[PDB]
Amino acid sequence: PADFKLQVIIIGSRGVGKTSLMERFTDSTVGVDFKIKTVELRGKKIRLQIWDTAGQERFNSITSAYYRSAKGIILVYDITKKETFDDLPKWMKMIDKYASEDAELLLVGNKLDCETDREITRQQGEKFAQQITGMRFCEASAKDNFNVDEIFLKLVDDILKKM
């Protein structure tokens, strides 16, 4: 049996790869889906519930409920679509309103495989995360399976440390 059950949520604007990231890592209720994954991490069995939320603003009200329960939040943008990076303050406002104060946060620049179409630099993503105390950052590619395990596993590691 599992040592821990944890909920994490994936948020961000539409088309950034939130569903692709969740499905690459793993395999009705309005505005949300979820996958369950049992991970082994530092000898601990963790039953992970990953909520995948709607991206459009009209769904903020529904999805807000799932923020409070989240022990970790993955906020995703698309490195090739600058407006998904420009939306991040809106997502940070959603976090301030609804997340737990103790929620762990991770910023992800997804679509690293599309490096030639890059609109946002790595420094931009790093500097954004750095402004938010405790927020981790990395770039990933759901398509190329780069940093996919790592965004979930690192976030889980951060969560477990702080309990």
Ligand X SMILES: Nc1nc2c(ncn2[C@@H]2O[C@H](COP(=O)(O)OP(=O)(O)O)[C@@H](O)[C@H]2O)c(=O)[nH]1
Which residues of this chain interact with ligand X, rule CB under 6 A?
14-20, 55, 110-111, 113-114, 141-143
Give the residue, chosen from 4, 19, 122, 158, that forms a contact with Mg ion under the rule CB under 5 A.
19
What DSSP letter does each residue of 72-132 carry, written as one string?
EEEEEEETT-HHHHHTHHHHHHHHHHHS-TT-EEEEEEE-GGGGGG--S-HHHHHHHHHHS
Q: Is 144 in the site for Ca ion (CB under 5 A)?
A: no
Which helix (H) or strand (E) element contains residue 53? strand 44-53
Give the residue, chosen from 3, 57, 83, 149, that forms a contact with Ca ion under the rule CB under 5 A.
149
Which entry of Ca ion, Mg ion, ligand X, none binds 149, CB below 5 to 8 A by partner kind? Ca ion
Nearer to ligand X among residue 114 and residue 132 (C-beta): 114
What whole-number distance in Å separates Cα of residue 52 and Cα of residue 21?
A: 10
Distance in Å, CB of 19 to ligand X, minimum: 3
Strand order in the sheet with 44-53: 32-41, 44-53, 4-12, 72-78, 104-110, 136-139
Which entry of Mg ion, ligand X, Ca ion, none binds 125, CB below 5 to 8 A by partner kind? none
From 36-44, 66-74, 83-91, 149-157, span contacting Ca ion (CB under 5 A)? 149-157
**Which positions lie near Mg ion, rule CB under 5 A?**
19
